[PDB]
Design a protein around this motif. Structure first.
Motif, mmCIF file in Angstrom:
data_model
loop_
_atom_site.group_PDB
_atom_site.id
_atom_site.type_symbol
_atom_site.label_atom_id
_atom_site.label_comp_id
_atom_site.label_asym_id
_atom_site.label_seq_id
_atom_site.Cartn_x
_atom_site.Cartn_y
_atom_site.Cartn_z
ATOM 1 N N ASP C 1 76.425 32.001 77.221
ATOM 2 C CA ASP C 1 76.785 33.140 78.057
ATOM 3 C C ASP C 1 78.058 32.861 78.849
ATOM 4 N N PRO C 2 78.856 33.902 79.064
ATOM 5 C CA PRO C 2 80.110 33.770 79.812
ATOM 6 C C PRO C 2 80.098 34.606 81.088
ATOM 7 C CG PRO C 2 80.572 34.059 77.489
ATOM 8 C CD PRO C 2 79.087 34.229 77.646
ATOM 9 N N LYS C 3 80.309 33.952 82.214
ATOM 10 C CA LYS C 3 80.355 34.645 83.478
ATOM 11 C C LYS C 3 81.769 34.407 83.934
ATOM 12 N N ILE C 4 82.482 35.478 84.268
ATOM 13 C CA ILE C 4 83.844 35.282 84.700
ATOM 14 C C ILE C 4 83.678 34.569 86.020
ATOM 15 C CG2 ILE C 4 86.077 36.405 84.955
ATOM 16 C CD1 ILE C 4 83.946 39.020 84.341
ATOM 17 N N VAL C 5 84.265 33.386 86.110
ATOM 18 C CA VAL C 5 84.172 32.627 87.330
ATOM 19 C C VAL C 5 85.495 32.899 87.979
ATOM 20 C CG1 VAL C 5 84.430 30.319 88.286
ATOM 21 C CG2 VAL C 5 82.608 30.788 86.634
ATOM 22 N N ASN C 6 85.470 33.686 89.041
ATOM 23 C CA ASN C 6 86.720 33.996 89.700
ATOM 24 C C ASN C 6 87.414 32.777 90.256
ATOM 25 N N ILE C 7 88.725 32.913 90.368
ATOM 26 C CA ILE C 7 89.575 31.929 90.996
ATOM 27 C C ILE C 7 90.461 32.754 91.909
ATOM 28 C CG2 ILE C 7 91.311 30.128 90.647
ATOM 29 C CD1 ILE C 7 90.251 29.483 88.060
ATOM 30 N N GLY C 8 91.036 32.136 92.929
ATOM 31 C CA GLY C 8 91.881 32.903 93.814
ATOM 32 C C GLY C 8 93.065 32.088 94.237
ATOM 33 N N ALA C 9 94.094 32.776 94.706
ATOM 34 C CA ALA C 9 95.327 32.113 95.067
ATOM 35 C C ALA C 9 96.163 32.944 96.023
ATOM 36 C CB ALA C 9 96.126 31.774 93.821
ATOM 37 N N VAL C 10 97.067 32.255 96.698
ATOM 38 C CA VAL C 10 98.077 32.891 97.513
ATOM 39 C C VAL C 10 99.405 32.335 97.057
ATOM 40 C CG1 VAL C 10 99.026 33.182 99.818
ATOM 41 C CG2 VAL C 10 96.541 33.179 99.490
ATOM 42 N N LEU C 11 100.292 33.228 96.644
ATOM 43 C CA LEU C 11 101.535 32.792 96.042
ATOM 44 C C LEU C 11 102.710 33.574 96.601
ATOM 45 C CD1 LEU C 11 100.320 32.338 92.349
ATOM 46 C CD2 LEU C 11 100.587 30.601 94.132
ATOM 47 N N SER C 12 103.916 33.095 96.322
ATOM 48 C CA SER C 12 105.121 33.671 96.907
ATOM 49 C C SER C 12 105.417 35.114 96.473
ATOM 50 C CB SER C 12 106.321 32.790 96.570
ATOM 51 O OG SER C 12 106.382 32.558 95.177
ATOM 52 N N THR C 13 105.340 35.384 95.172
ATOM 53 C CA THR C 13 105.747 36.693 94.659
ATOM 54 C C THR C 13 104.843 37.176 93.524
ATOM 55 O OG1 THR C 13 107.988 35.832 95.050
ATOM 56 C CG2 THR C 13 107.816 38.056 94.143
ATOM 57 N N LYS C 14 104.839 38.486 93.288
ATOM 58 C CA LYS C 14 104.020 39.107 92.249
ATOM 59 C C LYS C 14 104.300 38.538 90.853
#
Ligand SMILES: *[C@@H]1O[C@H](CO)[C@@H](O[C@@H]2O[C@H](CO)[C@@H](O)[C@H](O)[C@H]2NC(C)=O)[C@H](O)[C@H]1NC(C)=O
Ligand SMILES: *[C@@H]1O[C@H](CO)[C@@H](O[C@@H]2O[C@H](CO)[C@@H](O)[C@H](O)[C@H]2NC(C)=O)[C@H](O)[C@H]1NC(C)=O
Ligand SMILES: *[C@@H]1O[C@H](CO)[C@@H](O[C@@H]2O[C@H](CO)[C@@H](O)[C@H](O)[C@H]2NC(C)=O)[C@H](O)[C@H]1NC(C)=O
Lengths: 51, 417, 407, 99, 51
Positions: C1-14
């Motif tokens: 089974d696959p559960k999208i495991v979120n990741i997060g970040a803060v970065l300089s630009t889009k």
């Protein structure tokens, strides 16, 4: 006094000072006096063959 | 005249309203200095709830000073509010619970700071207890939270004076990341009288579990517990192998409500020492938007000019932790039946223990601490006063006691030192 | 089974956000797809001092990211801005990985316990200096540090390096930041025998340092200068001297490489992690929480032991402090008042580029750091048999007085 | 047992304990050691002697509590081979196998 | 004085350490004088200075 390592007031940790600390401090590069030679001092500084 | 703007928050699981004490403090507050108060309460603590609310009240009204009240002892909370303090520059303090609980080293920019006490000092308090009954402590371990490295030095500093005959046996760290076992196998190696604890109550919970398996819970392994655990006065993990000293400031000794007025008074006196004395007390102005540096730092804010003041004549001079430099401390023992029996109280420099005799844990074991009196004569034993200048007994001698004569009196009497 | 495991970040630009999402999508193929699902979330870091963090909790914590990545703001402003997150996630016990934070301010893991970064701090630069000192055989040096966690940390690190050897602590010199008048100390410095110098400071302070140093002619041949990346950069260069050794971190400017590399490395930490049981998701929702996240320290433990030596940024391994190990630096020289690469340093061993060595005074090689002192100030105490004290007889210093044996 | 003593004497490991099981010859082993250790002038120390076997389902508890007290550098063990496997797993948990 | 280290380290001499400390001098000229002045019955120092 030649000086001995002692608690530095509130700090409580300090250099032996006096003749020796000036030496650590570099005020006097070399110390010529009648100084007995002991291990407690010995770790901090080099000593010549006892005169 | 001045009409200052102030805010206070009461958060709690124990019943009282800010209004109750609001009007009270304003009445008490009324004569000494002008003050305008807005009171708000919130039920349970969160980083988001507290930050949002404090910014929500502060921005709407230009309050200059506030305090914080809680019925919870969570450890992280202090740091969070402290973080807000670094950016805002608005004075903050707290009177009870977690905010009162100690926190990591204060940043260069002044933060909120009523909770901390020189942990070193705290340890010296504990040492006084150790001086009375503790020598060659079993272990000091930098297990968790602030000062793992910091606590480590002081023990050395205490030991460094070398005035008496101090020594350590166990000196390690660690807990959760790997098998508890490396630390545990190392701990097995130490064989000493008093365990020293510097870990949070959560960690401690596990540690309690560790100690029972470890055998630390058994006699000859006393525990020295700070506010890190002690903080949950209301709740004690059953598994907490009792009888070990757990000690911090007591609610019964000082009322939680009691702390707030005095602080408000201090604020007033600070203003009288700042505002009246050629200084401008600026409003917070900007807290929730952009990154404009908050129109720079307030010029001549003078928040920390006074760190050693009084209120009502009370010597409330403060420490580097903003904490009463006249630590008002009480000694608490984890009792046989889940109770913090008052072991003793600390007044000024002197260390006080209510019972001179050492309590037998449960039943006396293998004739431990047999009460023996040796007569004093030139030939066998000789008695002289302890070095009261240090408050200690000579290293090559034995500290001694006796009963100050009170035969008629019910009391045995104390002829100590 | 696959559960999208979120990741997060803060970065300089889009654009960098798109780069992030792209790397994440590459990620599903590399680690097993069936076991887990990877999803990417990020922010473009609008500059609000205390609201970006609000959203981090509102969005990212509410999104329960298994980890967060962070980079220094694209806008060239503020210092050590990423202080709040380390505190905020701290309750969450959510691993954070910085790309661009090479600053040593967040080194204080007693309060920055949840904090981490791939790049080594400025303090770790001392690893080079010891190796540099090692090659040239100068055991005698002088250290000039600003007074702050940064400078003192550098001193501690270098001294710790020296501790393995006989501790070498001669001539440490502390000055406090923002000080324009600094010449007086250097007059003190001339006195000391050692002729090699190493310094750590900010760019603004460094201007004052070189400005004061040039007045006393410190830069002259027989003197050596070793320095941090910050010192060679900025205003420091313009009123600045010649023949001074310098350092620049490899791929320091460009996070994206560090983004893909950190993520590949983190991927090893999380994918391997799920091989273990008794795992718990990071606390869901900022509200209703006062408790730490039991997994977080474990995630830190695997992540520090993540391996992944092959990488866009270079070899990856983490020291005890969570700081990166064996980061490569490029040595720099001031030849003709311009920066040039005399050599490049990678791994534990320095590498010599074909370019000619430059030193103060122009000598091809300048190894000797022990010119020494002709005159020794001697100290004594008043002890009667071995020392006697008499006042100068008037102006005249002494007396012709004679020993019992005629002398 | 004598050879064990000679081995210990050769490396001059004076201080030791015995972990044993109810397996045959355990009581005498103690007796033979007592005589061999006792006769010699030297002040070597026997720290603990442990006799344990499964009883009900608390053998691990009782064994663990009983084994946890021990601190001695040199251990003589006596049991069936398989039992040795279990005792060693338990020792690995206890940390007794380490350096 | 270095002997103070001996008294310091010698917990055996703690008694004497303090007994000694309470009467100490900044220098030999005063320390010798006390015995000469008879202010102090005894003086302790290394022989080379004393003999
Ligand atoms: C995986 O995460 C991404 C990024 O966080 C999600 O994409 C966002 O979806 C929300 C819907 O609530 C939108 O409002 C955002 O605009 C999307 N991108 C963002 C947040 O920048 C995506 O929905 C997540 N996948 C799943 C299955 O939930
Ligand atoms: C920075 O301050 C120092 C110390 O006051 C100045 O050094 C003095 O220079 C004057 C000449 O203007 C001398 O008369 C003094 O003797 C110096 N001080 C000492 C220690 O004696 C220095 O001039 C100031 N900065 C500069 C270069 O203007
Ligand atoms: C920063 O990372 C970017 C993207 O990875 C690099 O841009 C690549 O440069 C190489 C040069 O060899 C090209 O082959 C690639 O096509 C570029 N984009 C990629 C790799 O997708 C950039 O070089 C890095 N910064 C520096 C200074 O090296």
């Amino acid at each position: 006094k030649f000086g001995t390592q002692e608690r530095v007031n509130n700090s409580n940790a300090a250099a032996w000072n006096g003749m020796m600390g000036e030496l650590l401090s570099g005020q006097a590069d070399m110390i010529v006096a009648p100084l007995t030679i002991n291990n407690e001092r010995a770790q901090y500084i080099e000593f010549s063959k006892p005169f | 005249f001045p009409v200052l703007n102030i805010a206070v928050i009461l958060g709690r699981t124990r019943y009282i309203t800010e209004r109750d004490i609001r009007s009270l403090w304003t009445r008490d507050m009324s004569l000494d200095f002008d003050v305008n108060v807005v009171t708000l309460l919130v039920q349970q603590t969160d980083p988001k709830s507290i930050i949002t609310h404090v910014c929500d009240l502060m921005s709407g009204t230009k309050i200059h000073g506030v305090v914080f009240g809680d019925d919870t002892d969570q450890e992280a909370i202090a740091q969070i509010l402290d973080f807000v303090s670094s950016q805002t520059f608005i004075p903050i303090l707290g009177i009870h619970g977690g905010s009162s609980m100690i926190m990591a080293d204060k940043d260069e920019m002044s933060t909120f700071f009523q909770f901390g006490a020189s942990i070193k000092q705290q340890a010296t308090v504990m040492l006084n207890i150790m001086e009375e009954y503790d020598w060659h402590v079993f272990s000091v371990i930098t297990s968790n939270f602030p000062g793992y490295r910091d606590f480590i030095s002081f023990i050395k500093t205490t030991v460094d004076n070398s005035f008496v005959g101090w020594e350590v046996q166990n000196y390690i760290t660690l807990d959760t990341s790997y098998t508890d076992a490396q630390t545990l196998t190392q701990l097995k190696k130490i064989h000493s009288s008093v365990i020293l604890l510097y870990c949070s109550k959560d960690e401690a919970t596990y540690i309690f579990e560790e100690a029972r398996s470890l055998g630390l819970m058994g006699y000859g392994f006393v525990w020295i517990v700070p506010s890190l655990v002690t903080g949950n006065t209301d709740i004690i993990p059953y598994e907490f192998p009792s009888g070990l000293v757990s000690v911090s400031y007591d609610d019964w000794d000082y009322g939680i409500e009691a702390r707030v007025r005095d602080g408000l008074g201090i604020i007033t006196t600070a203003a009288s020492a700042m505002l009246e004395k050629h200084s401008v007390i600026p409003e917070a102005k900007t807290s929730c938007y952009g990154q404009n540096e908050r129109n720079d730092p307030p010029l001549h804010t003078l928040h920390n000019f006074m760190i050693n003041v009084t209120w009502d004549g009370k010597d409330l001079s403060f420490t580097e932790d903003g904490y009463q430099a006249n630590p008002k401390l009480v000694v608490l023992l984890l009792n046989m039946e889940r109770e913090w029996e008052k072991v003793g109280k600390w007044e000024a420099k002197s260390l006080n223990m209510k019972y001179p005799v050492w309590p037998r844990i449960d039943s006396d074991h293998d004739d431990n601490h047999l009460s023996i009196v040796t007569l004093e004569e030139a030939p066998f034993v000789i008695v002289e006063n302890i070095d009261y200048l240090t408050g200690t007994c000579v290293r090559n001698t034995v500290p001694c006691r006796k009963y100050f004569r009170l035969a008629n009196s019910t009391t045995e009497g104390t002829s100590v030192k | 089974d696959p559960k999208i495991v979120n990741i997060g970040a803060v970065l300089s630009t889009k654009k960098h956000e798109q780069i992030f999402r792209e790397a994440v999508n590459q990620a599903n193929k590399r680690h097993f797809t069936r076991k887990i699902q990877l999803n990417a979330t990020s922010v473009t870091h609008r500059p609000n001092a205390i609201q970006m963090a609000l959203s981090v909790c509102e969005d990212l914590i509410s999104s329960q990211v298994y980890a967060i990545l962070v980079s220094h703001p694209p806008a060239p402003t503020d210092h050590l801005t990423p202080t709040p997150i380390s505190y905020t996630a701290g309750f969450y016990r959510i691993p954070v990985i910085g790309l661009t934070t090479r600053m040593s301010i967040y080194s204080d893991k007693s309060i920055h316990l949840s904090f981490l970064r791939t790049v080594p701090p400025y303090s770790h630069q001392a690893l080079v200096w010891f190796e540099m000192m090692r090659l040239f055989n100068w055991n005698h040096v002088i250290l000039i540090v600003s007074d702050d966690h940064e400078g003192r940390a550098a001193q501690k690190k270098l001294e710790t390096l020296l501790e393995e050897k006989e501790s070498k602590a001669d001539k440490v010199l502390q000055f406090e930041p923002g000080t324009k008048n600094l010449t007086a100390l250097l007059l003190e410095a001339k006195e000391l025998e050692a002729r090699v110098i190493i310094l750590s400071a900010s760019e603004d302070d460094a201007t004052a340092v070189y400005k004061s140093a040039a007045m006393l002619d410190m830069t002259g041949a027989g003197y050596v200068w070793l320095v941090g990346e910050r010192e060679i950069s900025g205003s420091a260069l313009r009123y600045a001297p010649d023949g001074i050794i310098g350092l620049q971190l490899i791929n320091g400017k460009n996070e994206s490489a560090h983004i893909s590399d950190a993520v590949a490395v983190v991927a090893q930490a999380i994918h391997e992690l799920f091989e273990m049981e008794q795992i718990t998701d990071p606390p869901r929702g900022c509200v209703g929480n006062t408790n730490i996240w039991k997994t977080g320290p474990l995630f830190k433990r695997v992540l520090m032991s993540s391996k992944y030596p092959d990488g866009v940024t270079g070899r990856i391994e983490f020291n005890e402090d969570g700081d990166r190990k064996f980061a490569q630096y490029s040595i720099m020289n001031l030849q003709n008042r311009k920066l040039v690469q005399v050599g490049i340093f990678d791994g534990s061993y320095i590498i010599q580029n074909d370019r000619k060595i430059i030193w103060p005074g122009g000598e091809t090689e300048r190894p000797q750091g022990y010119q020494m002192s002709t005159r020794l100030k001697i100290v004594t105490i008043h002890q009667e048999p071995f020392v006697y004290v008499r006042p100068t007889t008037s102006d005249g210093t002494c007396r012709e007085e004679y020993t019992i044996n005629g002398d | 047992a004598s050879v064990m003593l000679n081995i210990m004497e050769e490396y001059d490991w004076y201080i030791f304990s015995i972990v044993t099981t109810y397996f045959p010859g355990y009581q005498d082993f103690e007796n033979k050691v007592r005589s061999t250790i006792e006769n010699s002038f030297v002040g070597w120390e026997l720290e603990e002697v442990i006799h344990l076997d499964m009883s009900l389902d608390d053998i691990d508890s009782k064994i663990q509590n009983q084994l946890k007290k021990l601190q001695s550098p040199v251990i003589l063990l006596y049991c069936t081979k398989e039992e040795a496997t279990y005792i060693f797993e338990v020792a690995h948990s206890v940390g007794l196998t380490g350096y | 004085s270095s002997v103070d280290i001996y008294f310091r380290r010698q917990v055996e001499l703690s008694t004497m350490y303090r007994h000694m400390e309470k009467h100490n001098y900044e220098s030999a000229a005063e320390a010798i004088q006390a015995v000469r002045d008879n202010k102090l019955h005894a003086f302790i120092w290394d022989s080379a200075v004393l003999e």
